[PDB]
Structure 1
Amino acid sequence: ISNCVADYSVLYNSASFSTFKCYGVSPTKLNDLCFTNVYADSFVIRGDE
């Protein structure tokens, strides 16, 4: 992902998600920063793991 104006706040608020865990950042501060390179990884597995 590059050259984006990404509004993160319409996805942690305006969505139904089970667990939202950010690790080096906080979710409320995500609108203010700039990220230099973003990657996305998607799959589907069992929810005990």
Structure 2
Amino acid sequence: RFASVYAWNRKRISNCVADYSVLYNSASFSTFKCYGVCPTKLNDLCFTN
């Protein structure tokens, strides 16, 4: 259930752990790019939102 881009949806992720374990390395994706944290370190961090 993906949204039309004009009305893109959004879900909140909270009160949970992990799955930042470079999931993109499954190579099911055409592209994966981070604009903040380098991808390999995402799974070492804590987030508030």
Q: Sort the TM-score into its range (normalised by shorter chain).
A: 0.5 to 0.7
The structure with higher relative contact order (CA 8 Å, sep 6+) is 1
TM-aligned CA distance change 1:20 to 1:10, over 3 Å: closer
Gaps of 5+ in 1: 38-49
Gaps of 5+ in 2: 1-12
Percentage of matched positions with identical amino acids: 97
Matched, 1:3 2:1: no
Misfit runs of 4+, over 6 Å: none
Q: How much is the aligned-residue C-alpha RMSD, in angstroms?
A: 1.4
- 1:34 is paired with a residue whose SS is coil
- Number of residue pairs the alignment of both structures matches: 37
For normalisation by structure 1, the TM-score amounts to: 0.62
